[PDB]
Design a protein around this motif. Structure first.
Motif, short mmCIF file in Angstrom:
data_model
loop_
_atom_site.label_atom_id
_atom_site.label_comp_id
_atom_site.label_asym_id
_atom_site.label_seq_id
_atom_site.Cartn_x
_atom_site.Cartn_y
_atom_site.Cartn_z
N UNK B 28 7.02 -4.26 -12.59
CA UNK B 28 5.76 -4.63 -13.21
C UNK B 28 4.78 -5.24 -12.21
N UNK B 29 5.17 -6.34 -11.58
CA UNK B 29 4.30 -7.06 -10.65
C UNK B 29 5.05 -7.19 -9.33
N UNK B 30 4.90 -6.19 -8.48
CA UNK B 30 5.54 -6.18 -7.17
C UNK B 30 4.51 -5.73 -6.15
N UNK B 31 4.00 -6.68 -5.36
CA UNK B 31 2.91 -6.38 -4.44
C UNK B 31 3.30 -5.38 -3.37
N UNK B 32 4.58 -5.01 -3.28
CA UNK B 32 5.04 -4.07 -2.30
C UNK B 32 5.62 -4.70 -1.06
N UNK B 33 5.32 -5.97 -0.80
CA UNK B 33 5.96 -6.66 0.31
C UNK B 33 7.44 -6.86 -0.02
N UNK B 34 8.26 -6.94 1.02
CA UNK B 34 9.70 -7.15 0.86
C UNK B 34 10.01 -8.60 1.19
N UNK B 35 10.10 -9.44 0.16
CA UNK B 35 10.40 -10.85 0.37
C UNK B 35 11.30 -11.43 -0.72
N UNK B 36 12.20 -10.62 -1.26
CA UNK B 36 13.21 -11.05 -2.24
C UNK B 36 12.63 -11.43 -3.59
N UNK B 37 11.30 -11.47 -3.71
CA UNK B 37 10.66 -11.64 -5.01
C UNK B 37 10.19 -10.29 -5.54
N UNK B 38 9.35 -9.62 -4.78
CA UNK B 38 9.17 -8.18 -4.87
C UNK B 38 9.93 -7.54 -3.72
N UNK B 39 10.57 -6.41 -4.00
CA UNK B 39 11.61 -5.88 -3.14
C UNK B 39 11.15 -4.63 -2.41
N UNK B 40 9.91 -4.65 -1.94
CA UNK B 40 9.27 -3.47 -1.42
C UNK B 40 8.80 -2.52 -2.48
N UNK B 41 9.17 -2.75 -3.74
CA UNK B 41 8.67 -1.95 -4.84
C UNK B 41 7.20 -2.26 -5.05
#
Lengths: 51, 52
Positions: B28-41
């Motif tokens: 739903x809310x994944x900025x695309x960065x990979x930092x364990x909160x958003x997972x590159x998604x």
């Protein structure tokens, strides 16, 4: 002839009815009544994935 | 209980449940960065964007 039928001796045939209407609805018991589990052990043990 | 006779199996099921739930959350809310909160998604708020 009031005296000759004293109240002590006039046992009138009562109507065979007892007004035994008290709150007996127990639907809270009602639901979850046929699913009472009769254990042979006092304790009730189960697991709970808390996290 | 059967869920303790296999702590591996139970941990696998727990990880699968929480993993599916995290996947749904991140999609739903994944900025695309990979930092364990958003997972590159990229989700939907980085795919489509957030605001007007």
């Amino acid at each position: 002839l009031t005296n000759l039928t004293p109240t002590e001796l006039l046992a009138n045939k009562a109507v065979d009815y007892l007004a035994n209407s008290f709150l007996v609805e127990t639907p809270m018991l009602g639901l979850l009544a046929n699913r009472v589990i009769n254990q042979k052990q006092k304790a009730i043990e189960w697991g709970a994935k808390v996290a | 209980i059967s869920a303790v006779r296999d702590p591996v199996g139970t941990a696998i099921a727990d990880a699968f449940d929480v993993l599916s739930k995290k996947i749904n959350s991140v999609l739903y809310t994944a900025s695309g960065v990979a930092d364990a909160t958003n997972y590159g998604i990229f989700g939907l708020d980085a795919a489509a964007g957030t605001t007007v």
